[PDB]
Design a protein around this ligand. Structure first.
Ligand SMILES: CCc1ccccc1O
Length: 162
């Protein structure tokens, strides 16, 4: 297991524009195109992202290319965020993957409410962190995925991903 395999499980792979769990136009391995309800705006973002006229469909290679960029962006983002970087750098490599996963799903604004979880994670209070992480819109809206990511934070193992 690694961050790519982990996110591939959590995000799936779809080669045609689809709506994610929040109803937003998405493609590939959880590549968010736009929060706009306009399918044409999503097709425009797709064409811009890939550099050709895709008419809402891409190849596996193109999906994986966006995925590589998106994972990279998630990590570089964390490292640029003064609240996230110190916690991320305190973690072991497995728990870092849980952090990348969460930011990939939610974005940095998405994780702004996680201040108390962040402190517990930096303190290595793993069970307490795990309890706090589940008290969230995140957990309630995507419980099966959140349970996996939380188990990863709690244990520093890949047990939740088999
Ligand atoms: C709250 C979990 C977490 C830890 C460290 C960095 C990002 C992140 O979302």
């Amino acid at each position: 297991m690694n961050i790519f395999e982990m996110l591939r499980i959590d995000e799936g792979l779809r080669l045609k524009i689809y709506k994610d769990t929040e109803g937003y136009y998405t493609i590939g391995i959880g590549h968010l195109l736009t929060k706009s309800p306009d399918l044409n705006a999503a097709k425009s973002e797709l064409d811009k992202a890939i550099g050709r006229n895709c008419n809402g469909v891409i190849t596996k290679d193109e999906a994986e290319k966006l995925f590589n960029q998106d994972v990279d962006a998630a990590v570089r983002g964390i490292l640029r965020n003064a609240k996230l970087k110190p916690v991320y750098d305190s973690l072991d490599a497995v728990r870092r993957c849980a952090a990348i996963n969460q930011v990939f799903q939610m974005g940095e604004t998405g994780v702004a409410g996680f201040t108390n979880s962040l402190r517990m994670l930096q303190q290595k209070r793993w069970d307490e962190a795990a309890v706090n992480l589940a008290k969230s819109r995140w957990y309630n809206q995507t419980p099966d995925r959140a349970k996996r990511v939380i188990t990863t934070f709690r244990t520093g193992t890949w047990d939740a991903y088999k």
